[PDB]
Ligand code: HEM
């Protein structure tokens with residue numbers, strides 16, 4: 060006898076388990092057990108993943124309901140699971156979305172200058188360099204301090220909450236509440252701080268005092284700061300880290316992108332498609348009985364949308380494990396989700412990665428791992444797959 064198949068399958072972000080393609084072929088919606096002991100439906104084909112993400116009867120916010128089967132423990136107050144919904148309801152969606160585009164004057168120049176300064180410091184110090192802790196993550200943190208309008212010197216302390224905040228735990232995490240409450244207090248002070256006039260926090264600070272927003276709660280304004288910082292920093296630093304591994308392991312591609320940097324955007328789109336940064340499927344709770352493939356999902360059941368299941372599906376992306384810069388459907392991957400909850404930071408995340416890669420390849424065209432790939436240490440029970448350190452030479 061064997062137990063019910065457990066998720067997640069592997070915390071390694073450098074290879075996809077052969078198991079995923081076997082599941083997709085045999086049982087593209089299959090029962091699994093999560094780390095909490097709950098049962099869930101794991102969806103692993105492009106067609107069924109799209110179906111789930113485009114049907115709002117598979118609800119994000121209802122995953123926070125008391126008593127529901129859970130992927131993992133909440134790390135925020137349950138209303139924050141409906142974060143973008145709350146933003147929309149407050150009339151703040153357009154403003155938030157405008158503040159987080161990479162098109163603000165000087166932002167791309169700031170990103171480039173920051174990337175180049177980080178790389179120059181690594182070059183001065185000498186190999187080996189850690190491209191996660193001393194490049195990708197500080198570039199993410201600096202970008203988000205700029206986007207938010209908060210001091211660069213406050214980035215590191217906000218960043219250090221994230222190794223706990225984005226845990227994927229069976230049980231509530233006491234440190235997550237301590238850091239959440241602290242980071243909320245910080246953002247509440249930022250809204251009252253007259254020096255903060257630019258970026259997302261500067262714009263929220265002004266809307267807070269405008270009559271059209273007089274009944275929006277101060278808790279929501281502070282929450283938007285904490286959540287956008289954390290979500291953006293963890294996602295962009297983690298994606299860039301694991302994309303650099305995929306690039307370094309493909310010297311022919313590295314050389315092509317170094318020689319023809321106009322191909323970087325197509326390259327980043329393929330790196331997005333093959334990315335294994337999300338450690339778990341995206342959770343949804345059924346609010347009705349819904350047919351998904353051969354399974355009738357019942358009301359109140361948990362469904363997990365496996366992004367790599369979709370993005371490595373050969374029926375949608377032929378030769379899925381190969382980076383091909385001339386696919387006819389290049390942006391049709393699910394790396395930023397799909398439907399109601401499609402990532403509002405998608406443009407910023409593309410630009411962060413494009414600029415970080417462009418700068419790396421110009422400064423370190425010989426970049427290579429400085430340890431055998433199997434020696435990377437993959438963070439466990441976390442919402443992202445990331446190596447603890449990424450040692451390189453050049
Ligand atoms: C390469 C970088 C990123 C990746 C791969 C990524 C991926 C995703 C995915 C897959 C979703 C959908 C989640 C779901 O449907 O359950 C999503 C939603 C979200 N992303 Fe990102 N993201 C990135 C960058 C960012 C940035 C830079 C921000 C903010 C500054 C951000 C903020 C959010 C928010 C707030 C949502 C929820 C949207 C809603 O619920 O309507 N992300 N992202």
Ligand SMILES: O=C1CN(CCCn2ccnc2)CCN1Cc1ccc(Cl)cc1
Pocket residue numbers: 135139140142143224285286287288289290291294402
């Ligand atoms: O606002 C969101 C959106 N998330 C979408 C999936 C993760 N993600 C992050 C970036 N791109 C995708 C889910 C959770 N929350 C609430 C939340 C955000 C940030 C913190 Cl620090 C605490 C809670």
